[PDB]
Amino acid sequence: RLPPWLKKNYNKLKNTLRNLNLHTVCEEARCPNIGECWGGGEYATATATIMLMGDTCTRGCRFCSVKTARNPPPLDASEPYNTAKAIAEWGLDYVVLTSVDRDDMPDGGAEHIAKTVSYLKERNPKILVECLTPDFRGDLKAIEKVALSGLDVYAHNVETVPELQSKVRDPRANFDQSLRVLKHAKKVQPDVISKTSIMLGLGENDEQVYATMKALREADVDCLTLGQYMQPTRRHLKVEEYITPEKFKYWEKVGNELGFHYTASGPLVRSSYKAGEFFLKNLVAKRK
Ligand code: MET
Ligand code: SF4
Ligand code: SF4
What we know:
Elements: H1 9-17, H2 25-28, H3 34-37, E1 47-52, E2 56-57, E3 67-68, H4 79-90, E4 94-99, H5 110-123, E5 128-132, H6 140-147, E6 153-155, H7 165-168, H8 175-188, E7 193-200, H9 206-218, E8 223-228, H10 245-258, E9 262-265, H11 275-282
Parallel strand pairs: 1-4, 2-3, 4-5, 5-6, 6-7, 7-8, 8-9
The structure holds methionine and iron/sulfur cluster (2 copies).
């Protein structure tokens, strides 16, 4: 039994979404945060997450419930237009575009991701766009394609501390490669906001978490999120422990002192959790 800290705007977003051919990770993961992200924050912003390039990943990360197969179906060439259209009609404030990894594609899908960003920004430049990208196996030209697509925030996850990369992630991912992605995004587009996420509860200790946060700062990562690893099914990695609410508040203070522009830290925090609210409050510093 999970610890208890892991248990108008929303209905307006839900009713509008019912008519549009758009499908989210928010509902198709049964995310416990949909009440918060979908309009229930301080600024009442709407954030949601859409996953491009199919529902089958070429990788098999043991923390992740996305289905895996060696030869996923080909890309839906209509998805960039259909997605960007459906987002603009849904009326979102901040959208997180993410995707499965497509190691079967030479550019890992970067052109597909970039086309979606570009379509959306032309329809409505008022929408903030974050892309949570694959590592593209370190392909600098693929990273460059997305970084130049006009997005506001370039995100890519390290997921865990360097010592646990081989346990937690598919062998095609690693810590230095992920840092190279974030560094190259900033090199190609210096005014982009860079962002990464770490899960706690997988066996890391405090010394490794601090060292990781320090290294992320040296790589000029602007924003950080920390949340609890929650085991999707009994076949996935076992939870080593549930981090306390007060310990997550400790890490937020540590991230502030290290100079992250925001450190979103809490048991239910995910990469996309209230991403629009964190952007508005800490980067835009909007007065309500
Ligand atoms: C949907 S998981 C995040 C995006 C990408 N599949 C990655 O692991 O890097
Ligand atoms: S945390 Fe991510 S998937 Fe969950 S409701 Fe918020 S944006 Fe959607
Ligand atoms: S690459 Fe991303 S989508 Fe694929 S298994 Fe790993 S975390 Fe899940």
